Assembly symmetry: D2
Homo-oligomer: 232 residues x 4
């Protein structure tokens, strides 16, 4: 199966699969059952920023999510990503809706990888083109006329649909480690719009890094954030 | 056929196809017969730096080549690259040897594309990995144990072979223009090592931008820098 | 006196000092009488973006100004900035109001300088702190509680005042050229808000580069954009 | 007194002031007595690279030092730099020689600061100009004709002198934190040449961040790395 390292903005507490009992952000290391989590004060309808960062000396993966005039949620986990992930990866964004739903809109996505022996890859998407040839679009993910990436299905009045799933990987494989490396790092930012007619929107959004040929595993919908085939 | 925009470091004057009568750098716009050229004082055996730059307001494509303690060669041509190239391109490096030869070694390759409506792609290769999955290697181009990209054939004592050709494109398509754009730019740097047992080394090296599915055209060897099927 | 190279967003046609008879953008080379200009469709009240760029091989200084859903204004002038400016400079933003007025609000300011022999300086101000120790504030320029730089005077209901002038230079001197250089470039972006209760707002805004100890020259108010002591 | 956060490449074990009994790298938090250290296999005469990095979510300051074909030394310390340093700082490089000596040559210095509410400052010095107006040179630090910064005294045959001290701060104050910040980070790289006719060279080199008006404290020579007035 795929190897997944992901940072989840889980809008729906699925307490049956070990989620805390509130909307949380979390760090997922080969399982949907976050290695660590923090409580997230979700402001649905408001534009949120997420930042993710990691270097291989500190070996502490950390994320932060905020909105204008809101306090932030931060989470960190100590892990060495070379003991988890292959040397070549594809990075991407995943989202799902389930029986309950939301718009999983991405307004901007930026990413930096650095590998010293300095090699680097950077990309910055501030408006997603109508045909983004440097993206791999998986499942229901599309771009739209406002230059937004819609990870999960919406209808043409911008109403979100349920039981949906989608992802966007950067086209190019990213080299995040090698034998002779001295130090690797990456950073990642996306802005996002989560809108929902539901009291409790679902299911969330992730930034994620994976084996290069990653794909939406069978059965990974709703709570599994198009990421895992099961909640082990 | 492919659409080529290229910056040539032509080590061999092929005066039969309109090259000036000396080693030159040149700007090629859909033909090997440079739109403009300048004389290049080649120092074979020495590490050279080339820089290429362009923005769509100035609409002046310009390049500069130097070595330590050498004077530089600069060349520029006025052209609008949106009237020449498609909106999505692949960027790359090409080189050939012919009846006469050289090592076409690339020690570093870096590239920045910017598209304002800001979108950007950056990459920086300072040591080319043994299996560069973010490169498309075409013809005889390979990487080697020093972390160099060898565009054209060498033997294991580093001796160059003749009648050779190779290219390296960045894996990801680059978005260099769109309908609604305000301004696009790109920059490009490579360092290179040209070594030759011959009095007059051949044939040269280019940085080049092309239609996304570009490939070494039939018959493009030696003087045609793996770029064009003919010298029209 | 100071040596000024500036890019003007001149909201007020001062036809008595050679301005075209409409709102224009222009490139100023040691004089307020732009070396070249283009017509600018000003949308007062709307957030505008300006981009400026230059490299010393092309030797073409160019600028572009746009707003969302507006067409852009572009201008370029061929000049070698090493034959004009010293090797060490301070870069900054200037604005004035005169008998007629506007808010000269800067929402973001970013700048990149590159000097190859690669040396570089970058800065990016997206919200201007309440006490910006890396800025030199000249004349009436201040920052405000929204994290905006107000180049020219406003009152606390955001109403602009007339006969005003201000500038913001980056604290650090920027090295834009040297003897042994192969190639220098710079880029600059600011976003701005021009609001006015007047039919014809005045006087404008500039990005500018100058001798390191530059200061608001005596008499440089209104139409002289806090830049020149006279309109020669 | 100054507030110092520093990363030391301590070439001389001063076991009388709590240094481990070998050449070490270390993280100094308001004292020369490193909060944490690691053993450093010094290769005097060889060009070394040091990298330093930090973000305020992970709150783990970490450094790595290597040379070509050498294994690396890495060190990390958990600390929140907002509970230690002011909001505005100057960053710099310090070095000393003592009764024993070395050349403290810096071939390149690069630095990135990022502050999200994104503000950023970057600089990259690959050859230090003969008169670096964007540097504050303190004590014996000068630049030289090879475009190297010599932190500590050398004579004109490149022989190092003893009992010396010098520093180089970036001219501009750096904004590394504020009240409303979501996340701050910085990164820093320098390359260095330590040469010595002595069996046991002294005293070392640091990258350091400090109150904005920092200066070489009285008595801070040799083992105190021009950083602290005493070894408390
Ligand atoms: Ca969940
Ligand atoms: Ca030729
Ligand atoms: Ca005017
Ligand atoms: Ca010591
Ligand atoms: Mn969860
Ligand atoms: Mn030619
Ligand atoms: Mn004018
Ligand atoms: Mn020590």
């Amino acid at each position: 199966a795929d190897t997944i390292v992901a940072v989840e903005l889980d809008s729906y507490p699925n307490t049956d699969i070990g989620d805390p009992s509130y909307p949380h952000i979390g760090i997922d290391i080969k399982s949907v059952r976050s290695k660590s989590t923090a409580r997230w004060n979700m402001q649905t309808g408001k534009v949120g920023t997420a930042h993710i960062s990691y270097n291989s000396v500190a070996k502490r993966l950390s994320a932060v999510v905020s909105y204008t005039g809101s306090s932030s949620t931060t989470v960190s986990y100590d892990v060495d990503l070379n003991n988890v992930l292959p040397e070549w990866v594809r990075v991407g964004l995943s989202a799902t809706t389930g029986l309950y739903k939301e718009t999983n809109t991405i307004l901007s996505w930026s990413f930096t990888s650095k590998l010293k022996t300095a090699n680097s890859l950077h990309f910055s998407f501030n408006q997603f083109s109508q045909n983004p040839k440097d993206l791999i679009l998986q499942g229901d993910a599309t771009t739209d006329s406002d230059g937004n990436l819609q990870l999960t299905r919406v209808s043409s009045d911008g109403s979100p649909q349920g039981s949906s799933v989608g992802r966007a990987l950067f086209y190019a494989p990213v080299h995040i480690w090698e034998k002779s490396a001295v130090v690797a790092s990456f950073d990642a930012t996306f802005t996002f719009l989560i809108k929902s007619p539901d009291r409790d929107p679902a299911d969330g959004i992730t930034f994620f890094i994976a084996n290069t040929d990653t794909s939406i595993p069978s059965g990974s919908g709703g709570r599994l954030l198009g990421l895992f085939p099961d909640a082990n």
